[PDB]
């Protein structure tokens, strides 16, 4: 049928530009044949298909490639990611809803929907009458909406009794103070 | 953090190519090979940073070049078709009457050719639809997301239709509010 070629570059940053690693993958369909890994220092053949390339590139493009760690990785991070990606702050919306139709003293589940936030770092906690809940809390993975915002659903297994106050507590960099939402039976 | 400055994918036959920049897993932009422009997902970013599309074109031309060379090297080993798997979920919490966006996340795509469309009450939708480029996966397959703007109501039910060579028949992922 068809044939595919993929070229995938990766600039891995740690502690800002304190540690930058550059990995470049050359792939045929789904087989990576030759890879440049700055931790290694030169191109390498992953499979036989890469020998015709590794050999030659280490002679004519080694230094050019190594320099991209500064000319591309660091340059992009400091000069373009800095004023855009790294400055993006989107506050999470938090709302609680009950899974099953209410009926006091009957087991149920509270769903805290924390949505539309960026970046990914976030902390979501459940409290019941001022005490933090742990064992009965479950969560989805961090969901990437694909539009530069995430969402996550945190559930609490509970039994609504009169007078109780259930609180979903969210902490995020875009927030000076935590966002809390209460639900009373 | 992780920046992928120049993901370049080329496919034959058809002369299908894609050039994108991803940061922390999100799409910074893709270069429209035909119009020869850098298309930023967040339009405001194009005000604080810029990329010359030529770099995109050039990298694609090279992708094309390395495809012939590699196709010959494998003795023309065609790409295996995979079965794409779709998941539908709302962007915001569902509220009767409140404008929202349904998201169709399709993973394990390979090769990078697919049709992702929407059906509302079993009929095809045209307006309010947008789609991302293919994102790379650790296993070298791709993922893609489609978007449908909509208002939650009692009568409307939806489907994300995925048509791919690895699927005997277009698959429908059903979704309806509560």
């Amino acid at each position: 049928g068809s044939f595919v070629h993929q070229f995938q570059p990766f600039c891995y940053f740690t502690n800002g530009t304190q540690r930058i690693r550059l990995v470049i993958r050359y792939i045929y369909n789904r087989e990576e044949y030759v890879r440049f890994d700055s931790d290694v220092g030169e191109y390498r053949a992953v499979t036989e298909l890469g020998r015709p390339d590794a050999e030659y590139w280490n002679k004519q493009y080694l230094e050019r490639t190594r320099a991209e760690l500064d000319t591309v990785c660091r340059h992009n991070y400091e000069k373009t990611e800095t004023p855009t990606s790294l400055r993006r702050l989107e506050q999470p919306s938090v709302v609680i809803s009950l899974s099953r139709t209410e009926a006091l003293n009957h087991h149920n589940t509270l769903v805290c929907s924390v949505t539309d936030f960026y970046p990914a770092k976030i902390k979501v906690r459940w409290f019941r009458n001022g005490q933090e809940e742990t064992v009965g809390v479950s969560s989805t993975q961090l969901i990437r909406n694909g539009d530069w915002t995430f969402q996550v659903l945190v559930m609490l297994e509970m039994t609504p009794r009169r007078g109780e106050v259930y609180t979903c507590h969210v902490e995020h960099p875009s927030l000076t103070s935590p966002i809390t939402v209460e639900w009373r039976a | 953090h992780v920046g992928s400055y120049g993901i370049t994918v080329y496919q034959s036959p058809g002369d299908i190519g894609q050039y994108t920049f991803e940061f922390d897993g999100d799409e910074l932009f893709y270069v429209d090979l035909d119009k020869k422009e850098t298309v930023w997902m967040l339009p405001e970013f194009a005000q604080l940073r810029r990329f010359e599309p030529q770099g995109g074109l050039q990298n694609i031309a090279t992708g094309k070049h390395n495809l012939e060379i590699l196709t010959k090297r494998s003795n023309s080993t065609p790409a295996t078709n995979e079965a794409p798997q779709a998941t539908v979920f709302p962007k915001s919490p569902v509220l009767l009457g409140q404008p929202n966006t349904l998201i169709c996340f399709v993973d394990n795509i390979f090769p990078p050719v697919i049709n992702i469309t929407w059906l509302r009450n079993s009929k095809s939708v045209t307006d309010g639809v947008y789609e991302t480029s293919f994102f790379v996966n650790r296993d070298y397959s791709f993922h893609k997301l489609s978007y449908l703007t909509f208002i939650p109501s009692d009568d409307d039910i939806y489907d994300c239709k995925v048509e791919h060579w690895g699927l005997e028949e277009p698959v429908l992922k059903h979704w309806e509010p509560e």
Partner: peptide, 16 residues
């Protein structure tokens, strides 16, 4: 203004 660059995919050798 703010110029963005990418990585440069390199060509591969032939024959031999």
């Amino acid at each position: 203004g703010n110029s963005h660059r990418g990585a440069i995919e390199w060509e591969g050798i032939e024959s031999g």
